Design a protein around this ligand. Structure first.
Ligand SMILES: Nc1ccn([C@@H]2O[C@H](COP(=O)(O)OP(=O)(O)OP(=O)(O)O)[C@@H](O)[C@H]2O)c(=O)n1
Lengths: 225, 225
């Protein structure tokens, strides 16, 4: 029963595409995969990350909980719809019901690691502690990422949430000086599990699966479960 | 003899314009101001943060140690240039020498809080501990700012660096739903000392002075030294 929380250094760094990529790689290794989005904001703009994982990677086991119309931080999105945040134990139950031996359960947060998912001040990091997940950290290759990554990793070690590694969510072609350097530096901060090529979401079923299996070290993925 | 480290939740949050705006407000309160930027990068395209502070706020005690031509993070810019960052001792004693009774000494980093500034691995945080400065955190008003701010505040707390407060480096006009929510939300996390209007960096000195004197609570400024 392997639970893996998929966080990121920010909003829009590619958490969702990494989830699909990692799900795809794992399924291609015969590993059962469930993906879980406990807090989904922006549904009124049409955002639905579970649907994107499904479309991209063919995952059928998709689990949602809270959905808010506005594209905001959950607390703001909720209060705008006159809705409340889910309870901490509500989020943990969701993940727990998905968890089982042999299965890789991916939990994609909302935005970065310390976004509030439940009141008071409950975040993905607290959730990680409760389900004993490790955390996969999705990062950009852009200027500013080293700080953001170091901050997120520190935040994680602060509650002894293991770090499963880094994934560069979007990797330009060709990479510029700044992108190249940041990769080398990021790799020194932590294990870089993969660097997904820019625009991977434009790929069709096969192209995505092909990309995904190329992207991750097969021994790492096999060894997740 | 007040030293104040000015740091940001990322690149381009407006650290420089906040240094200048506080320096300006402080001067108009009768306080002597020094700004220190020990490492300046991106000189090949004219990046000169100290000069901006000079033009906007009229500060004259503007001190620096290193100028790397590449628009990168110091350590990377240095390695591209084939020359080490300055030694830890250089930065701390520069700041220490700037410091004097009756004076506000602002120290501006390069990017975010855990960016390496000196050899070896010395960050702006280590510097703040060494010179016993409080830390002023420049933030955005954009989606993602709550996470970035909380990560930065946590990192500051983990080494017992006090937080002088937050400043939104660029307040949009009109604000829009996210920015309006975030300004309230940042105030729930830490004191919001000021929110500088978008575009303030293009102001001439006189206009910048007037904006600055309105941007901060005068008592807080007065009580800084
Ligand atoms: N290798 C990649 C990485 C990202 N994307 C695109 O870039 C955007 C950002 O990716 P996403 O996974 O949605 O970002 P998240 O980190 O998941 O942002 P959020 O917090 O809103 O879920 C998406 O439209 C996605 O299709 C892409 O084309 N290919």
């Amino acid at each position: 029963a392997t639970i893996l929380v998929v966080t990121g250094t920010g909003t829009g760094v590619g958490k969702t595409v990494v989830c699909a990529a990692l799900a795809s790689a794992a399924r291609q290794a015969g590993i059962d995969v469930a993906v879980c989005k406990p807090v989904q904001t922006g549904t009124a703009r049409g955002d639905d990350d579970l649907a994107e994982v499904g479309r991209l990677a063919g995952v059928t086991q998709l689990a949602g909980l809270a959905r808010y119309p506005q594209p905001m931080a959950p607390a703001a999105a909720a209060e705008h719809a006159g809705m409340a945040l889910p309870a901490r134990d509500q989020i943990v139950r969701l993940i727990a019901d998905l968890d089982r031996p042999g299965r890789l359960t991916l939990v994609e947060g909302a935005g970065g690691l310390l976004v509030e998912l439940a009141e008071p001040g409950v975040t993905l990091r607290d959730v990680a502690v409760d389900v004993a997940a490790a955390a996969l950290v999705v990062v950009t290759a852009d200027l500013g990422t080293l700080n953001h990554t170091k901050l997120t990793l520190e935040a994680l070690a602060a509650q002894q949430v293991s770090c499963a590694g880094l994934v560069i969510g979007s990797w330009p072609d060709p990479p510029g000086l700044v992108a190249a350097s940041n990769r080398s530096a990021l790799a020194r901060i932590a294990m870089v599990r993969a660097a997904l090529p820019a625009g991977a979401a434009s790929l069709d079923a096969g192209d995505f699966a092909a990309m995904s299996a190329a992207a991750f070290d097969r021994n790492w993925v096999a060894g997740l479960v």
